[PDB]
Paper text:
The Type IV Secretion System ([name]) is a potent weapon used by some bacteria to infect their host and can deliver effector proteins into eukaryotic cells as well as DNA and/or toxins into bacterial neighbors. In the Gram-negative pathogen [name], the Dot/Icm [name] delivers ~300 effector proteins to the cytoplasm of host cells, in some cases causing Legionnaires’ Disease. Central to assembly of the apparatus are five proteins that define the core complex: [name], [name], DotF, DotG, and DotH. The map can be divided into two major regions: an outer membrane cap (OMC) and a hollow periplasmic ring (PR).
The Dot/Icm [name] is ~400 Å wide and ~165 Å long, consistent in shape and size with [name] complexes visualized in intact [name] using cryo-ET. The global resolution of the map without imposed symmetry is 4.6 Å, with the highest resolution regions near its center. The OMC can be further subdivided into two features, a central dome and a flat disk containing 13 arms that extend radially outward. The dome of the [name] OMC is positioned within the center of the map and is about ~50 Å high and ~100 Å wide. While cryo-ET analysis of the Dot/Icm [name] in intact cells included a stalk bridging the PR and the inner membrane, this portion of the complex is not observed in the reconstruction of the purified [name], likely due to dissociation during purification. An axial section through the map in Figure 1B,D reveals a large cavity running through the [name], starting from the bottom of the PR and extending to the OMC region that spans the outer membrane, although there appears to be density in the central cavity closest to the outer membrane. Notably, while the disk exhibits the expected 13-fold symmetry observed previously, the PR contains 18-fold symmetry. As was reported previously for the H. pylori Cag [name], while the Lp OMC and PR make physical contact in the lower resolution map with no applied symmetry, the connections are lost in the refined structures due to the symmetry mismatch. The high-resolution structure of the [name] Dot/Icm [name] allows us to compare the structural organization shared between the H. pylori Cag [name] and the [name] Dot/Icm [name]. Both structures display different symmetry within the OMC and PR; however, the symmetry mismatch itself is conserved, suggesting that this feature is important to the function of secretion systems.
Author numbering:
A (entry chain FD): 25 to 159
B (entry chain Fd): 56 to 161
C (entry chain Ed): 24 to 55
D (entry chain FC), E (entry chain EC): 58 to 161, 173 to 268
F (entry chain GH), G (entry chain FH), H (entry chain EH): 273 to 361
I (entry chain FK): 41 to 188
Amino acid sequence: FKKPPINNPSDDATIKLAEAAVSVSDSMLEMAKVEKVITPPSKDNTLTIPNAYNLQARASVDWSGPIEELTARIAKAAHFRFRVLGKSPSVPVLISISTKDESLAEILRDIDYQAGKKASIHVYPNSQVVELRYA
Amino acid sequence: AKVEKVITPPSKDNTLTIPNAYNLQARASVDWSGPIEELTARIAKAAHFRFRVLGKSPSVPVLISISTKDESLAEILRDIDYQAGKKASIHVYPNSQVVELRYAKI
Amino acid sequence: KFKKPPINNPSDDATIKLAEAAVSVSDSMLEM
Amino acid sequence: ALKETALSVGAQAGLAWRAKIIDEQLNKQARNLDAIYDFNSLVLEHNILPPVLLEGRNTLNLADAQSIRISDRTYKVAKQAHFITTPPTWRQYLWMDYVKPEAPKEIWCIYTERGWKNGIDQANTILEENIARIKEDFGGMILYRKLLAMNMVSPPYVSHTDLGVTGDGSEIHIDDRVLRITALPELNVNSAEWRAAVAK
Amino acid sequence: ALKETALSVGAQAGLAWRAKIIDEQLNKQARNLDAIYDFNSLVLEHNILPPVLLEGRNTLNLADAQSIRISDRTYKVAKQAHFITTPPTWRQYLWMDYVKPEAPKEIWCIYTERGWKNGIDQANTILEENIARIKEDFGGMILYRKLLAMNMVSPPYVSHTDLGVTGDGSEIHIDDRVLRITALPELNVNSAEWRAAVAK
Amino acid sequence: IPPSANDLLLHVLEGVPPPGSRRLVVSGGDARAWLSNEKMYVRTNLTILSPGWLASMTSADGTHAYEMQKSPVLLVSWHGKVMQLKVEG
Amino acid sequence: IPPSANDLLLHVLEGVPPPGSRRLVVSGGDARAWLSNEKMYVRTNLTILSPGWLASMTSADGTHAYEMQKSPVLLVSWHGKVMQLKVEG
Amino acid sequence: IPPSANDLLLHVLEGVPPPGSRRLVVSGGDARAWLSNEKMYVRTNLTILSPGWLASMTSADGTHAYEMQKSPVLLVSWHGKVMQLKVEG
Amino acid sequence: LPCRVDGACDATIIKMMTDLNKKGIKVASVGQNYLISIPASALFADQSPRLNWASYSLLNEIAAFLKQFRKIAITVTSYSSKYVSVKRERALTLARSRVVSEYLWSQGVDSRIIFTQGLGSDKPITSYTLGGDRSPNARVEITFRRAV
C-alpha cells in the first residue's frame, strides 16, 4: 500500500491555488524567456581557453585592482611576455579575482570578462605573448 | 506574458548555449529558494562538471527559487538561466566539462 | 550496534569556539 | 452588559485563534505563495522594485448637477520605483500577528460564542484586506511590465558614475561605483508612441 | 517575583562558575594560544605594533530610494601603528574575570537553574566577543603584513636622532638615541603600485 | 473644470481600503464598503441602482467601485433581480 | 554623493560588536546581532531575504554583515531552505 | 623632545622606594613594587611580559626596574616559564 | 520557545536503521554521509521500471527514515546487471531511479534537491553476475549527507 502526497493539493481551494501557482510559474518562465537577452556562443566575444601547457598551471589569486599588474605578473607566472597595447585611463580598469586553486588560463578568461568593454585580452601562445588591449 | 511575447518575438532560445549532454541527462527534482551559486555548484557537482564563475558577485544576491519536479539538469540550468534574467547567465561547455555562471557587468 | 569511529573526550564550548577562531587565523596566516 | 463584556472576552480570543489557524494555513502553502508572489523575478535589472500602476477603466465623476467628467481609462502610479536590496516576500503582507492572550454563565456562553464568531470574521476581514493589498501591489507591478511592453511608461534610467580608489590613507574603497536613478518611471502622455498588442 | 530574584541569584553565580571553567580551560591550552596569537613575532622592527586592517568586500549602501554606493573592497585602518615595549599576550583579551560572589523552594530551584543556564550562555557570549576581539586584532595585523607585501599600505618610518653625551654635571646620559615615528602607515591610494601575488 | 474622478477609486477597485477609513458591514451581496470622510466606497460586481453614486470606476473583470454618499441601503441588480444590501455606519 | 557604507560593518564583519551597543538574541540560526542606534547589525553566513537591509559587507569566508532597521524576525535562506530568525529588541 | 626616563628608576633599580610612596605586596616571585602617584614601580630579575611598561632601567647585575601603569597582574618570564604575580593596590 | 527535536529522535533513527538492516536494506553510514542500499528485487520486478505494490511499504519506511534528518540533496542512483544492452540498462535504471524518487518526492522528504540517475552496471559491487534483478549488483541506493 502506498500513500497520498503529504502537502498535496487534496482540497478544493488548494487545487485552484496550486493550479494558479503552476500557471503563474510557467507564465513567469515565458516572460523571462522573451526578455532574457542571450548571446550565441559563436558570437560571444569573450576569450577562449588558450590551451598552452604553461597556461594550464593551477594558480591562486586573491587580488582586486588594475588589470595591467595582474596580467603582467600572471604573464611572468606563465613565463609569457606581456604587451600592453593602448592607453591606460586615469580611472583604472578594476578587476577582482578571489580563488584559491584555479587555472590561470581561466583566471585570464574571467579578467577578460571583468574587463568587458573597457579592455580586452589577447593571447598568442605560439609567440608566447599576452596582450592587454585598451580602447 | 501575452503582450510581452507579442511586442518582442523571442528570437533565440538558450539551448544553443546550454546544450544537453551525457551526465546532464541525469534527472533532478528541485525546490530551492536561495542564491544561485550553491544551487549551480550542486547541479554541476552531481553532473560531474567543473563549476566556475565569471564576474565578481553582486552585493545584492541574485536569488532564484526553482520549484519543479523530475527533469534533467540541462533544462534545470535553462530554468536557472531564465530566472536569472539580465543578472546572471548559465553557459555549459560540454566538449569539456564546464558549467559556468556569469554575472552581469553592472 | 551503530557507531561512528572517533568517540573522544567531551569537549566544551570554550575550546570549540577557540578552535573555530584558530582555524580562521591559521588559514589567513597561511595565505599571508 | 455582562453579556457584552462576555462578548469582548470572546472577541480577542476568537481573533487570536483565527489568526493562528490562518497562520499555519499560510505556512502550509508557503512554496505555492512563493510561486504566486514572485516579486524577485519582477524586479528591474539594477535591482529596482518596479512601481505599482493601478488601472481604472470606465471612469465617471458627477461633479454637480450640471457637469460630469468621464475618462475611458486612468492609470495612476503609486509606490514609485526604487532601489530595492532584498525583494519583498508575501510574509510582509499576509502574516497575521499572533499573540496568545492570557486574559479571561449561560448568556456568557452564548454571547461568548457570538463574540468568537465576531473575532473569527474580524480576522477574516483583516486577511481579506491583506490579500487585497498584495493583489494591488503585485498586479500593479505586472501592469508596469505590461505598460512598459506597451510603451506607456518610461523605464528607469540609472547612472553608474564610477569612482576608482577612494579615500585617504586610513580608508580606501577600491572599486567605488555610485549608482543613481536619475529618471523615475512615469507615464508618457505622448499618445502616438504606444504599442497595441494583437494576439492569435 | 521570588522566582525572578531566584534567577537573578542564579545568573551571577552561573556566569562566575562558567568564567572559572573557561579560565582554567584557557590555562590548559596556554602554550597553544601562545603559538596561535603570536603577537611577538608579528611586530615590526623598531618594536612598532602594526596597525589593524579591516577588509570588507562587496560593500553596498542603500542611501535612499534613488542612490546606492557600491565598492568592491574597502580597507580600514583601526588601531594605528605605535611603539610597544612588550608585545600583547592573549590574556589581555581572553581572560574573563573570576570573582566568587558571596551573595545568596521548588520554583526557586527550577528558576535558579534557568538562571544558571542564562549565566552560562551570557558568559559564553562574553567569551565569544573576546575571541572575536583578539581575532580582529590578529587578523588585522596579518592583513597589514599582507597588504604591505602587496604594497597597499606604506611601512612606518622611524627616525632615530642620535644625541651623544647629554645632560649637565648632575645627570648624564651616555648614548641618548631618541626614536620617533615620522610617517605613520597609511593605505596608498595611487593604485598602480600594487602587487598582485599569483601562486602555484 | 470638474475633477477627473476620485483617485481613491483605484484603491477601492481592489479590495484595499483608503488610508484612514472605517469598514462597513455589507449584508446580502458580494460588495465591500468603506467610509472615508463622509463618503462611502463600495467594491462590487453588482449594479448599483437606488442611492446615487458620485463617481465610478471598473476594473478588467467587471469589478466596479463606486463613490457615493452614506446611504444605509443599497439597491443592486444581481442578474436582473432587484435586491437590497444593508450596511452599518 | 552618498556615504560609502557604514564602517561599523567591518567591525561586525568580524564578531566584535560596535562600541556602545546592546546585543540582541538571535534564535534559530547561526547569526549574531547588535543594536547600536536604532539599527541592528547582523553577522551571518545565511542570506537575508525579507526584511530589507540598508548596507552590507562580506568577508573572505562568506560571512556577511548587514545593517538594517530593527526587525523582530529575519527571513533567511540557509541552503534553499527559507527559515526565520527571532531577535529580542 | 621627549623626557629621558624617570630618575625614580635609578632609586628603584636597587631596593629603595621612591620618596612619598606606598608599598605593594607582590606574591609569586622575587619582585618588589611601590606606587608613587598612579604609576607602579617594580624591581625584579624576571622579565615582565603583559601589562605594558612606560619606562625601564637595568642595573649592572641585571636587575630591572620598570615604571608602568598600575596593573594587578604581572605576567613574567622566569626562565622561559610564563608565570603571573599579583599585587595589591 | 525554540524546538528541541526536529520532529525526530535518535532512538527512532537507530530503530529504523537496525530494522532496515534486519529487512536486508543495508544502511551504511560513514561519518555524515548515509547510504541506504536496496536490492532491486525488493522494489521492482525483473528488468522492469515498475514497482510492485508491496514495495511501497518499504518506501514508506524509507521515507519515514528519511524524514528524521535535515539534508540538502538526496541523490538516488540505480544499477542493474546486464540484460540486452548498456543503453537498455541505462534507460531502465534511469526510469527506476526516477520512479523511486518520484515517490520519495511525493512523500515527505525535507530535501531540497533529489538527484536521480541510473548507470548501466558501471559500478558492480560483486564480480558474481548470477542473474538479473536477484543479483546484489542490481540495486538502487540512496545517498545523502546529513547536514548539521
